[PDB]
Amino acid sequence: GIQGLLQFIKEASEPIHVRKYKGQVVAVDTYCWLHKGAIACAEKLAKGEPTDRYVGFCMKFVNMLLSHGIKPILVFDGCTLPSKKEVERSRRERRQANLLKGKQLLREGKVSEARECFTRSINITHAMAHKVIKAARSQGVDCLVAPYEADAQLAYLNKAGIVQAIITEDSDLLAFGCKKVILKMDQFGNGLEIDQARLGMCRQLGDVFTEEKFRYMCILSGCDYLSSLRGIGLAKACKVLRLANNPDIVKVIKKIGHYLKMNITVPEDYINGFIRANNTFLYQLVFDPIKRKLIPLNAYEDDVDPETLSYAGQYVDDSIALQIALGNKDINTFEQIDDYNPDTALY
DNA sequence: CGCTAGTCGACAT
């Protein structure tokens, strides 16, 4: 997530209602609804006690979209991307820590702080997501599990003309290159739409409204793939890309000391990490619903060599990718949990 | 001004 990005391009936003997309298809980052729905029943999840509140919680939004004449495609997170594995490990550590700390604070009499701590121990499993999948198929709503991050999958679905908008709370989608992103959408249909074409309405951006320059800016500001340099946020990065009339980003990053008038020293780790980040934003593996094949988010440019993009995602046989995408195969144990078939009845 | 980083809402009773 790009920290403070939404406030940064606030001028490119537009308070709309989902009715705007009536008779059209919209893909959804379901993790948001899953998380929020899981907050309501944090105790049950922390104790391991059975629950299904988040299911109905998601079904509220789903049935709402269906009521306003929208066709939603619920997209779920799949395998763990090696690029964002540090953050994953940290989040897991803090999850277990908050779990046990909650289990101990429950004994101090502070039931309030125990549940407050259980709110920060929410771990969205793939079983829950599968409950949501089945519940969605009950209403005939198409579901799709991304090979890796949901972000990339959604980005593909939006850039390939399969969907026109993306419902989410993550500003990461904008960096990937989504045309229209609906944020802050409530249970009634009220959300904030950000159109890429409106990026020109931002004075702070300047000539950084192109997808590539915008990507560079989002990366330099700090992302889940690469921590930003000490003292480099959105405005300074944007300033760099504004003042730099150079297609080669590498030399620019090397002369970041010259562009920003700051005595900046760039480690060798950061250049490689940057190339990694950009290659991850560009060529992260997604799943084509039509051709049923594992493809990168974008067409492989002749610049980069695909054999050095293992961090962007590893390939598998497209049948396995299909069985994962349908949610039939477990993301973790790789074992068959279901046997749903779209043939014998999006694709 | 601009950026880091730590706090705490989100659900909902």
Add this chain to the structure above:
DNA sequence: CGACTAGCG
């Protein structure tokens, strides 16, 4: 997997 704000350049 986010929106504030104190604290500092």
